[PDB]
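re: that complex we talked abt at group meeting.

here r the seqs, copy pasted straight from the sheet so there may be weird spacing, ignore it
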Amino acid sequence: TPVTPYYGPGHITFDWCGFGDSRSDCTNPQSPMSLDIPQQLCPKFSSKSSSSMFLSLHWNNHSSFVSYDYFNCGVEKVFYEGVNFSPRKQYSCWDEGVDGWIELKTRFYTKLYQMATTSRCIKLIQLQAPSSLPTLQAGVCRTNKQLPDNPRLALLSDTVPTSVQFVLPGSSGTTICTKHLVPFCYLNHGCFTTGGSCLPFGVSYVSDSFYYGYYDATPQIGSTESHDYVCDYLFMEPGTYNASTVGKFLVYPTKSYCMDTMNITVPVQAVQSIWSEQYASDDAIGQACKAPYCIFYNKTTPYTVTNGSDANHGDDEVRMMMQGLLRNSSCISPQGSTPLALYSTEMIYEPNYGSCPQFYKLFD
Amino acid sequence: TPVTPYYGPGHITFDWCGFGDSRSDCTNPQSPMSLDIPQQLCPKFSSKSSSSMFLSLHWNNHSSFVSYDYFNCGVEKVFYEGVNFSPRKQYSCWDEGVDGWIELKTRFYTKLYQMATTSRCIKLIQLQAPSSLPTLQAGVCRTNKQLPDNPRLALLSDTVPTSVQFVLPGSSGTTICTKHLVPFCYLNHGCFTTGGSCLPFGVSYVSDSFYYGYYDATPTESHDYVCDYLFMEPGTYNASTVGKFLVYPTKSYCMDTMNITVPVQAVQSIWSEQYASDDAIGQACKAPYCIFYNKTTPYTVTNGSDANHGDDEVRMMMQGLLRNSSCISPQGSTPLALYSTEMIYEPNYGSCPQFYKLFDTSGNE
Ligand SMILES: *[C@@H]1O[C@H](CO)[C@@H](O[C@@H]2O[C@H](CO)[C@@H](O[C@@H]3O[C@H](CO[C@H]4O[C@H](CO)[C@@H](O)[C@H](O)[C@@H]4O)[C@@H](O)[C@H](O[C@H]4O[C@H](CO)[C@@H](O)[C@H](O)[C@@H]4O)[C@@H]3O)[C@H](O)[C@H]2NC(C)=O)[C@H](O)[C@H]1NC(C)=O
Ligand SMILES: *[C@@H]1O[C@H](CO)[C@@H](O[C@@H]2O[C@H](CO)[C@@H](O[C@@H]3O[C@H](CO)[C@@H](O)[C@H](O[C@H]4O[C@H](CO)[C@@H](O)[C@H](O)[C@@H]4O)[C@@H]3O)[C@H](O)[C@H]2NC(C)=O)[C@H](O)[C@H]1NC(C)=O
Ligand SMILES: *[C@@H]1O[C@H](CO)[C@@H](O[C@@H]2O[C@H](CO)[C@@H](O[C@@H]3O[C@H](CO[C@H]4O[C@H](CO)[C@@H](O)[C@H](O)[C@@H]4O)[C@@H](O)[C@H](O)[C@@H]3O)[C@H](O)[C@H]2NC(C)=O)[C@H](O)[C@H]1NC(C)=O
Ligand SMILES: *[C@@H]1O[C@H](CO)[C@@H](O[C@@H]2O[C@H](CO)[C@@H](O[C@@H]3O[C@H](CO)[C@@H](O)[C@H](O)[C@@H]3O)[C@H](O)[C@H]2NC(C)=O)[C@H](O)[C@H]1NC(C)=O
Ligand SMILES: *[C@@H]1O[C@H](CO)[C@@H](O[C@@H]2O[C@H](CO)[C@@H](O)[C@H](O)[C@H]2NC(C)=O)[C@H](O)[C@H]1NC(C)=O
Ligand SMILES: *[C@@H]1O[C@H](CO)[C@@H](O[C@@H]2O[C@H](CO)[C@@H](O)[C@H](O)[C@H]2NC(C)=O)[C@H](O)[C@H]1NC(C)=O
Ligand SMILES: *[C@@H]1O[C@H](CO)[C@@H](O[C@@H]2O[C@H](CO)[C@@H](O)[C@H](O)[C@H]2NC(C)=O)[C@H](O)[C@H]1NC(C)=O
Ligand SMILES: *[C@@H]1O[C@H](CO)[C@@H](O)[C@H](O)[C@H]1NC(C)=O
Ligand SMILES: *[C@@H]1O[C@H](CO)[C@@H](O)[C@H](O)[C@H]1NC(C)=O
Ligand SMILES: *[C@@H]1O[C@H](CO)[C@@H](O)[C@H](O)[C@H]1NC(C)=O
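got the structure back, here u go
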């Protein structure tokens, strides 16, 4: 008798974990009305109300930034966060606009999901301040919104080449760090006018066996000088590195995602994380969560609360999807989960893993 | 009824293709004694004796380099080349050594296989020269071996920051190019002394939506030739320099898009034991994007054209491509069935049987 996949995420052994936001945070004063997951699954999630994994990479706590030290381990991984950095927030820093940060959000989750599939543990860590830091003036956003804390952007007193050393540790507590996801950011579009002349913007992360950099000294035309805050999200092995500069501008990381290694690749699972239609959302999660590294469980309805704490907590669709995490499944796929069975009532697509039933019509 | 994976590549549909070298080239004067594939499968392959996809990206024709215009389309893809750029060749250009070039080979194939999984067609194209080009002097290798023709490395007649424009086309003949695999290379390790000073080496590829760059001005003067293999959308780009050194691509792999992600298949491509091979293909061909079929024996010929054409093991493996298959995996191919007599691992695709022991009702298990 063919089985029907249950639409939503799932797990095949005990060794699974979740990463989330208010909708999976049982410490919320309105829990369990504010949850989209079953309450009994709160212990499987690393979650904080008003946070996201992207926001927490770039910022610590500020007036409208709730930063959380995300930390969890699992061969299988379910992500249900993201919404707390969306166009509703109206955030930009330099001239890149709100859409600029939705691109950076997309880049970050893309890299996080990829790196996650070869790791068990993922831990957001604070990095040590470099030793012997020269004098530094804090960077600012042109928008005067909060400058990211990571990576640090600061200004030296002079314009000559210099370098500071940062350490990506090989472990954090009992978590081994076989690699790090680290942001590399810069102000693009030519020379940057400060100290009374238009200076080259040139920064890099280097070691004996690593290089990533940016350089631009292109002159500005008339009064049109404009720069965007841009980031690339890098895979970096543990060890000691230099944050280098051709002068004036210094960029070095202050936080990273520490990850360990597991010897089998397993796609992660991401559930669409959006606001009600009162507010502006984006599709960064869906654009980041792509075969072969991520199984994306989209919503087919708006965020729709009939018995929750407010219009943005207690979506009926996601609540139904998350019931899938209560079962001990054999097959995980974009169609959802199944137990061990010969046949399926529908085609099972990729990515999938475990032992999956085959579409019954194939056997007539 | 139960099935057992047949070790070797395979195909589930009519829409498949191969990429290769002498060992799948029916134009070779010694064919079919020189083949490792069934002779009747030659028309499914884009192959040239003495070439590889890596070599052909970086070089056009020279006395030691047989460059081929690789081109083929298929949802499912079987790669069987690589050997014609191996440590046997002892190629290096600056101070990176032969190992340096094995690392670049590995980088290239990694990117090739990844990008191939969402493309149907793959076509090596000659890009047009930038329409405006100042006077240029060709770069050279310290070793005096042949400088790669792609990307071009050349020297302007002053140190003025400069850009030239290159075009990655939206199509080539009937093939649509939705993306391009393009090399970005540079000489690393500090400033480079020429024309009377130690000049910064700073080059980049830039558009309104794209930046990739390298810069170093820092103080034996040693340099390595280093490349990265970049995914780039069709369009016009600046090849920019902070002065003197100019790098721009002259060839790319043009690829289209298909709306499914299918792992590629790569078979180990090595020389006989008396020569130096590498495991770039094994290191490049990884889950989740590529299914690697390694050799378990040396390159061993009992009925072929020479000691390096007609391997018994690969010949047996390539018989898999004649089979009725519904499931393709690192264990090999099976036809449509309920149960497999052995465990099937990843990457795999199609409709795959489940491991028989999971359904045992004895229970002696
Ligand atoms: C690629 O490989 C696959 C897998 O091996 C092939 O698919 C199989 O093809 C065979 C042969 O056609 C199929 O087996 C045949 O099924 C026919 C229908 O059987 C159904 O209906 C009867 C009741 O009428 C049920 O009992 C049965 O369980 C099925 O529900 C039968 O007519 C065939 O019987 C033949 O063999 C018996 C032997 O005793 C004799 O009666 C006759 O000789 C008779 O011809 C047979 O059972 C099989 O179903 C397919 N398997 C799968 C898994 O789909 C592909 O054909 C092959 N493709 C190519 C191009 O080679
Ligand atoms: C590197 O150099 C080699 C030459 O040393 C070069 O290989 C040659 O390529 C050409 C064209 O791809 C081949 O010529 C063809 O050979 C086939 C026989 O198999 C003929 O059918 C072809 O004729 C048809 O097409 C012609 C147009 O090209 C028409 O003129 C004609 O009417 C036919 O329609 C054609 O002659 C040639 O066989 C190979 N030679 C070798 C030794 O491989 C290779 O292309 C060069 N690489 C690069 C990147 O330029
Ligand atoms: C494809 O198949 C190849 C042939 O089997 C594999 O070759 C193996 O490659 C690995 C490294 O990836 C080598 O491992 C090294 O082993 C040495 C010890 O060498 C000696 O002992 C081994 C085992 O008894 C023996 O195989 C050697 O010949 C030596 O006698 C260690 O010092 C290293 O740290 C490293 O672990 C294997 O040696 C090598 N085997 C052969 C026969 O060439 C290849 O790895 C396969 N590729 C993939 C992707 O699976
Ligand atoms: C930013 O500010 C908030 C406070 O406004 C900090 O939140 C606090 O974080 C700690 C450590 O996570 C929480 O303690 C934890 O409580 C749970 C559940 O009871 C327990 O299992 C943990 O082991 C831990 O003790 C604390 O409750 C929380 N406070 C509030 C009001 O939420 C947050 O850490 C700050 N972020 C950063 C990046 O510094
Ligand atoms: C997830 O589902 C949503 C809702 O269908 C998709 O968003 C729609 O995208 C289409 C096509 O671009 C637009 O016409 C709609 O107006 C969008 N609707 C909403 C509510 O935003 C979204 O693209 C899906 N994400 C992925 C990755 O498939
Ligand atoms: C709305 O949600 C509330 C909160 O979870 C539900 O209240 C629970 O209902 C069960 C029985 O169905 C009780 O055993 C629990 O004690 C209740 N919990 C709390 C915190 O009140 C309620 O059932 C839901 N209402 C509807 C109409 O579905
Ligand atoms: C290559 O770089 C040049 C020069 O830095 C860019 O030229 C500028 O582009 C815009 C047109 O969109 C003009 O308004 C500016 O006046 C141009 N500046 C100069 C000095 O000509 C050009 O856009 C770049 N080309 C590409 C394809 O990215
Ligand atoms: C890196 O920074 C340190 C300062 O801590 C400096 O001593 C060292 O020379 C730098 N290395 C390079 C290659 O710039
Ligand atoms: C792929 O999907 C796009 C829309 O997402 C569509 O325009 C196109 O027809 C499809 N292309 C192919 C090759 O199937
Ligand atoms: C050896 O190769 C020839 C030429 O293709 C073939 O016809 C013959 O069957 C082979 N001989 C043996 C013993 O396999």
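couple things i noticed - The longest strand of chain B covers residues 179-187. The pocket of ligand 4 is lined by residues A 27, 60-61, 67, 69 (CB under 6 Å).
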